Write a protein that binds this ligand. Structure first.
Ligand code: HEM
Length: 154
């Protein structure tokens, strides 16, 4: 699968808005993930104990991790599919150390789409959401291929 330049531009134009406040977007996205799919919270040993959205919002560590995730994802998106180098360490750590199944990457992709849809109707209309879905699907497809190479089913 291959995105068009027009599709990448739709992806990068909403990402420019995320970057006005990556910390805030990261909090919203992780909270959405943890609330919609509470099982995902178990993979974070710093966070598996968090009981409420208020606790999640107050966690400086969660905020930091949200910035780390979205900044790594942003760097991937800006490669416009040419992300082999970026995917290598990410696939290795997530397959082998953190043990994050592909299904959970699907869950966080859902959270990203949901938050962007809510925050950015000006840059996340139907065409832009389609483009972002395509970009995240490409990311997951390529990560899943790497998981397999690394010896993890995902
Ligand atoms: C867009 C998808 C994601 C991206 C771009 C991303 C990125 C990152 C990065 C850059 C790190 C730090 C370096 C590393 O260990 O590789 C990290 C760590 C980590 N990630 Fe992910 N991540 C994603 C999804 C997830 C999901 C869905 C989970 C769990 C449900 C998860 C769990 C973790 C954990 C437990 C760590 C280690 C945290 C720590 O040591 O404090 N990640 N991630």
């Amino acid at each position: 699968m291959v995105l068009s330049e027009g599709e990448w531009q739709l992806v990068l134009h909403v990402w420019a808005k995320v970057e006005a406040d990556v910390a805030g977007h990261g909090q919203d996205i992780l909270i959405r993930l943890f609330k919609s799919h509470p099982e995902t919270l178990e993979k974070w040993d710093r966070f598996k104990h968090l009981k409420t959205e208020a606790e999640m919002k107050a966690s400086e560590d969660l905020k930091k991790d949200g910035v780390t995730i979205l900044t790594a994802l942003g760097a991937i998106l800006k490669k416009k599919g040419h992300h082999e180098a970026e995917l290598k360490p990410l696939a290795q750590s997530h397959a082998t150390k953190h043990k994050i199944p592909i299904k959970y990457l699907e869950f966080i992709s859902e959270a990203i789409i949901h938050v962007l849809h809510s925050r950015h109707p000006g840059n996340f209309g139907a065409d832009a959401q389609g483009a972002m879905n395509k970009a995240l699907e490409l990311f997951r497809k390529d990560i899943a291929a790497k998981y397999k190479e690394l010896g993890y089913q995902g």
